[PDB]
Every structure is written in C-alpha cells, then in structure tokens.
Amino acid sequence: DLEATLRAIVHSATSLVDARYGAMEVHDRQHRVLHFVYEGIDEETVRRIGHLPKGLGVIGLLIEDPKPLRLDDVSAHPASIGFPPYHPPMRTFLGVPVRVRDESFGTLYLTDKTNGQPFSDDDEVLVQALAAAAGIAVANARLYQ
Amino acid sequence: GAMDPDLEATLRAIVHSATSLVDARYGAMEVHDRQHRVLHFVYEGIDEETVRRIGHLPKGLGVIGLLIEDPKPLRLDDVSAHPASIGFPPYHPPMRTFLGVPVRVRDESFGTLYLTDKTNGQPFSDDDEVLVQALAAAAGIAVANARL
Numbered sequence: 001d002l003e004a005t006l007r008a009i010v011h012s013a014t015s016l017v018d019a020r021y022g023a024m025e026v027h028d029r030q031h032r033v034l035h036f037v038y039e040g041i042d043e044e045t046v047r048r049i050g051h052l053p054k055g056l057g058v059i060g061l062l063i064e065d066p067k068p069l070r071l072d073d074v075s076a077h078p079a080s081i082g083f084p085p086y087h088p089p090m091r092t093f094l095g096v097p098v099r100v101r102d103e104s105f106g107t108l109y110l111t112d113k114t115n116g117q118p119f120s121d122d123d124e125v126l127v128q129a130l131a132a133a134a135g136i137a138v139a140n141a142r143l144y145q
Numbered sequence: 146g147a148m149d150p151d152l153e154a155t156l157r158a159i160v161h162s163a164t165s166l167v168d169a170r171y172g173a174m175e176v177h178d179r180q181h182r183v184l185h186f187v188y189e190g191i192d193e194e195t196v197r198r199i200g201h202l203p204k205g206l207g208v209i210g211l212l213i214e215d216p217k218p219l220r221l222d223d224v225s226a227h228p229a230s231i232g233f234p235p236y237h238p239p240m241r242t243f244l245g246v247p248v249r250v251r252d253e254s255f256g257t258l259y260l261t262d263k264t265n266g267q268p269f270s271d272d273d274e275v276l277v278q279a280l281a282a283a284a285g286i287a288v289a290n291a292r293l
C-alpha cells in the first residue's frame with residue numbers, strides 16, 4: 001500500500017525533526033491531488049476544515065519550483081495563500097519535493113517545530129533524504145499503475 | 146552493474162543524514178541481494194587514498210552479520226572486542242563505538258546500515274538508535290521499490 005508507505009515517511013520526518021504537524025501531498029501531472037496524508041491534527045478538527053488542500057500558496061510554490069523552502073513564518077511569504085477556516089494556526093515551515101531524477105510527484109512538509117524553534121539545515125537535509133525514499137516508492141507505484 | 150541512479154542518490158543521502166545526525170565519524174550501508182550477499186557498499190568518512198590502500202571491499206562479515214541473524218539494533222562500545230568480530234583489514238581505520246541496524250521491509254531484509262566512532266568519544270544513544278532505525282526503514286522502502 002503506497003498510502004501506508006507515505007504515512008510512515010511522514011511519521012519519520014515529523015517525529016525525528018520534532019515538528020507538531022507533518023504532511024505529504026502527491027499530485028498528478030495536472031496537479032490534482034492523488035494522495036494527502038498527514039499527522040498531528042485530531043479528526044474533529046479535520047472535519048471542521050472540511051475540504052482537502054489543492055496545493056496552493058507555499059505548497060503551490062514548491063510544486064512550481066521544486067527545491068527545499070524553510071520559513072520562520074509561513075504566512076509572511078509573498079506566495080502565502082493563508083489557511084482556510086478552522087485550520088490550526090501554523091508558523092514555522094519546512095517543505096521539500098518528493099521526486100526522482102525524471103520527475104517530481106509531490107511535497108513533504110512540516111510545521112511548528114517544538115518549542116517555537118525554526119527548522120534547521122540538519123532538518124532540511126534529513127527531510128530531503130526521507131522524501132527521496134518516498135520519491136522512489138511513488139515512481140514505482142506509477143509504473144505499477 | 147551500477148546501482149540505479151535514484152536509488153544510489155537516495156542511499157547516499159540516507160547514509161549522510163544518519164552519519165551527520167548521530168555525530169558518527171564513519172557511516173556505511175550494505176545493499177544485499179538474495180541470501181544476504183553484499184551487492185553494493187556505500188560509505189562516508191574515509192578519504193580516497195585510504196580507500197585505495199584498504200583495497201578489497203567488505204564481505205559483510207563479523208559483527209555486521211549479527212544484524213541479519215538478529216534483526217534488532219546492535220550497539221557496542223568496542224566493536225572488535227566482540228567474539229563474532231572478524232577484525233579490521235590492513236589500512237582500515239581502527240573503530241570502537243558501533244551502532245548497526247538491519248535494513249528491512251516487514252520481515253524482508255535488504256542490507257545493513259551502520260555507524261562508528263561517535264565524535265565525542267561517547268557511546269551511541271537511544272535517540273541515535275531510534276533515528277538510525279527510522280533511516281534504515283526509509284532505505285528499505287528505497288531498495289524494495291527501486292527501478293528494475
């Protein structure tokens with residue numbers, strides 16, 4: 001199960017960096033969301049947010065220009081779209097492409113590192129390594145699909 | 146044959162992250178084929194001239210073999226003092242502290258990941274162990290899914 005694999009990867013990034021929230025979006029070539037897996041948010045809150053993300057704002061930027069982006073305050077970025085109603089507030093941000101050499105498929109991202117601290121270069125490098133493994137898994141899934 | 150380029154990039158990244166984050170002097174991964182045979186060996190911490198002097202690549206012997214018969218993390222404070230230790234070959238840096246884990250997906254085994262000589266002279270920690278286990282699990286995903 002690809003979804004399972006992806007969630008495991010999200011868990012490793014979130015727990016190892018010690019971020020409150022972690023997510024991964026995987027899209028098709030027309031940027032429709034194929035998979036969205038996450039942790040750190042309770043189910044009642046999920047229900048309140050309602051609609052799934054479409055990959056806009058800073059995530060949209062990460063799709064257009066796939067390279068790591070680390071932010072002290074995600075809302076202060078010029079490409080920030082803002083959160084929908086009921087979405088938990090989130091401040092610090094680290095996002096990287098999930099990809100292989102031939103193609104990028106998605107974005108693995110974390111917010112609100114513990115104790116208000118910004119994401120570090122070490123965190124960036126770690127999340128890239130985890131994302132790479134995801135990238136191979138997704139590339140295999142397409143070949144299989 | 147050479148490893149798949151994406152696989153190789155991914156495994157080198159995982160080895161680098163593990164080595165950096167547990168503050169090890171040396172880190173390495175063996176990728177295995179059938180019957181736990183070493184197929185590829187990825188490492189960092191050793192200069193090219195020393196690699197030349199050592200010559201032959203590891204067969205995955207000694208303490209590294211325990212990672213396969215006992216699929217659990219192994220930490221040791223003096224690796225070459227272990228009775229299963231085969232010893233270092235000529236020109237190989239001496240190494241003391243060791244943290245090793247199997248690389249797996251479910252029960253299926255794909256290699257080993259291991260680090261030596263934490264830079265502060267200290268033993269590898271519980272946190273180091275958890276981190277290296279998670280990175281090994283990611284390496285397992287990478288190897289299992291790699292382009293044939």
Ligand code: HEM
Pocket residue numbers: 021022023038039040041046049050051052053054055056057058059074075079080081082083084087090093109110111
């Ligand atoms: C728990 C992990 C999550 C993280 C780390 C996260 C992070 C983010 C971030 C960083 C933004 C950027 C807004 C901007 O550009 O200013 C965003 C927007 C958004 N989020 Fe989340 N989020 C999470 C969970 C969820 C869930 C569970 C949902 C709904 C089920 C959701 C729905 C949305 C929507 C609809 C947007 C607006 C932009 C878009 O449509 O992509 N988020 N989120």
Ligand code: HEM
Pocket residue numbers: 171172173188189190191196197199200201202203204205206207208209224225229230231232233234237240243259260261
């Ligand atoms: C830089 C990361 C490396 C680490 C962490 C590492 C670690 C180890 C350890 C702990 C042992 C002893 C096992 C025992 O006594 O049971 C060993 C043995 C050995 N090493 Fe390394 N080593 C590294 C690099 C290399 C390189 C670059 C070479 C060759 C160019 C090499 C060749 C060997 C060989 C031939 C043995 C003998 C056992 C066998 O063949 O498996 N090592 N290594």
Ligand SMILES: [Ca+2]
Pocket residue numbers: 271
């Ligand atoms: Ca302990």
